[PDB]
Amino acid sequence: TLDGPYQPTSFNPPINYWLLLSPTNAGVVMQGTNNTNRWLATLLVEPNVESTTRNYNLFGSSVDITVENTSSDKWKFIDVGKTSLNGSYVQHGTLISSTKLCAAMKHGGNLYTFSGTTPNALPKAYSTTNFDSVNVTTFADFYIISRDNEQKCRQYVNNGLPPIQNTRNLE
Ligand SMILES: CC(=O)N[C@H]1[C@H](O[C@H]2[C@@H](O)[C@@H](CO)O[C@@H](O[C@H]3[C@H](O)[C@@H](O)[C@H](O)O[C@@H]3CO)[C@@H]2O)O[C@H](CO)[C@@H](O)[C@@H]1O[C@@H]1O[C@H](CO)[C@H](O)[C@H](O)[C@H]1O[C@@H]1O[C@@H](C)[C@@H](O)[C@@H](O)[C@@H]1O
């Protein structure tokens, strides 16, 4: 099977698969909802950004969110979520990254993302509800990696993708 890249799309990912996103621009990298109690997204902020309110298109709504990135040279992914249709978005985990890659996976009812600072970022779980039915819309090219191959996804998130579109053959 070919892990990617695949172009931006919407689907409801099966459990036990990492989605590895390779965004080009700051903004909304991906979003997802179960239409009941979770509306989630990952934001990307470029290096060297003072506290500033930016507009983000989340599920078609214009949402103002105050962000910052005090890293002088690394990009910052920010996990955000709300827990009701009209609730406020809250910022949770962050990933400080020199590779510009982030990832998410549904497993065991939890939603895993990477957090920390590359090259030592690790998957951490969100477990405030059962996330198995949350879908995704990606706004960047992405790769699909099984949990059985989680070590590949950790390696890419922390150290970068290969220089050729052959991740299928490269570990
Ligand atoms: C395998 C492990 O120890 N941690 C991996 C974790 O596995 C946990 C999930 O299956 C989770 C789902 O609910 O269940 C955990 O069991 C917990 C329950 O979470 C908790 O509710 C209950 O009360 O207590 C039990 C305790 O037994 C599982 O342990 O899944 C993560 C997402 O895949 C994964 O990232 C994590 O992998 C480990 O990560 C740590 C760093 O935090 C180290 O790097 C480990 O080396 C790494 O394990 C390695 O990767 C995992 C995916 C698997 O391939 C391992 O065989 C491998 O050594």
Author numbering: 64 to 234
Provide excerpts from the study:
The P genotypes are further classified into five genogroups, P[I] to P[V], based on the sequences of the spike protein VP8*, one of the two proteolytic fragments of VP4. It has been found that almost all P genotype RVs in P[II], P[III] and P[IV] groups that commonly infect humans recognize histo-blood group antigens (HBGAs) of the host through VP8* in a genotype dependent manner. In the present study, using a multiphasic approach, including X-ray crystallography, glycan microarray with a dedicated probe library, bio-layer interferometry, site-specific mutagenesis, and molecular docking and dynamics simulations, we found that P-VP8* can bind to all blood group A, B and H(O) antigens but on type 1 chain only, without the capability to bind to any Lewis epitopes or mucin O-glycan cores.
The structure of P-VP8* in complex with LNFP I was determined at a resolution of 1.29 Å. The bound ligand LNFP I showed clear electron density. The edge part of the glycan binding site was composed of β-strand K, I-J loop, and 210-loop (residues 210213, which links the β-strand M and α-helix A), while the base part was formed by W81, M168, and Y175. The binding of H-T1 pentasaccharide involves a network of both direct hydrogen bonding interaction and stabilizing hydrophobic contact. Gal(2) is in direct hydrogen bonding with H170 and N173. Gal(4) participates in two hydrogen bonding interactions involving the side chain of R217 and also hydrophobic interactions with L185 and P186. However, R217 of P-VP8* has direct hydrogen bonding with the nonreducing Gal residue of LNFP I, and therefore is the key amino acid for selective binding to T1 backbone chain, whereas in the case of P -, P -, and P-VP8*s of the P[II] group RVs, the VP8* interaction with the Gal is through E212.
